C-alpha cells in the first residue's frame, strides 16, 4: 500500500511530473506588488515582459517515467536509472518528431491510466468445464449464472489456472481459495437429486448470498439452508455486538456468551 | 553461656522428595482437570510465546 509514485495524484503522471519538477510558484493545488523592491519589481517586470524559453524534454520524461513506475513497468528504486537511459536515448535521437511522440505518448498514457482507475480465466474455465448434464440443464445454468454474477460484482476477486484446476479466491491478501474444479466434479453427480467435500461447501457458502435455482432439487434446498444460516449469523452477529457492548457498561462474558451463543 | 559470644542466626528448609508446583489457574487453585484458564479464549485460540 506504499505510494507508488511521490505525486499527491497518484494517476495524471504529467500532473505529479509538474508537482516534482516545477517551482512551488506556478503550480496551485486546492504579496502586494508595488510595495516590493526595486530589484524584485525589475525582474519579475522583465521576465513578465520578455518570458524565458525552456526546454520541456526533462519534464516530458519525468512524466513518462512516473507513467512507468504507476504501470509498475519500472520498479521504485530503478525510477533514475530510468530516467537517465531516457534522456540519454532522446538527447542521442532529439528531434521535433521525436518532441511531438514524446508528447502523443504522454497524453496516451495519461488516457489509459485515467481509463484504468479474472473474467477471462472463468470463461476459460466454463469452456473447458462440460456444459450438458443428464440431470436437469437449469440448476447448473442458474448456478453458472450466479457464478459469474458474484465473481463480476466482486470489488477484488481473483479467478486463474494452477496446473490442471481453476480456483477461486475472494480477495488479493485473503485466506478464502475455492478449487472451483474439484467443487463442479463433486456437484455434477448431484445436480437435480452431509456428502459435500469442504471445498465445495465453502463454495456454496460463498454463492449463497449472491443467488433462480429451484427449491425442490437438491441445491436448491442446501441453497436455502445456506442463505437460512447466514442470515442467523448476521442476526447472531448483531446480538452478540449489542449483548456484548451492553454488558460492558469481561473476557470471561464474552466467552460464556460465545459458548451459549454457538 | 555468661561468657557467650554474640549470634548470626541462618535459617533453612529442606524440601526431598516435593515437585514445586504453579497451577495454571487464575487463583492459583486445582478446581479440575482443566482449568480456569487453559480452556479460555485468550489461551486456547492464539498463539503464546513463552519466556
Known sequence: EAPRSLGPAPSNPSLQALFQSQPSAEQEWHGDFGSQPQANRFGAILEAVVPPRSDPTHEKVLAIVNALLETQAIRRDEAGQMYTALLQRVARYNSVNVQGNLDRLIQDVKEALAQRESVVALNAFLSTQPAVVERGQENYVAFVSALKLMVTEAPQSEVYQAGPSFFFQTSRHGSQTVNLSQAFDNLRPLWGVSLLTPNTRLLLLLIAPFTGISRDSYLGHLLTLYRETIGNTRVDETTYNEITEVSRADASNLQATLNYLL | ?51
Do not use: V
Not at chain 2, 557467650?4 to 535459617?11: I, K, M, N, T
Not at chain 2, 482443566?34 to 479460555?40: A, V
Open chain 2, 1 to 51: 553461656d555468661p561468657r557467650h559470644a554474640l549470634r548470626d542466626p541462618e535459617r533453612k528448609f529442606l524440601c526431598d522428595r516435593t515437585l514445586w508446583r504453579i497451577p495454571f489457574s487464575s487463583n492459583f487453585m486445582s478446581m479440575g482437570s482443566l482449568t480456569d484458564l487453559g480452556q479460555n479464549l485468550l489461551y486456547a485460540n492464539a498463539a503464546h510465546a513463552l519466556d
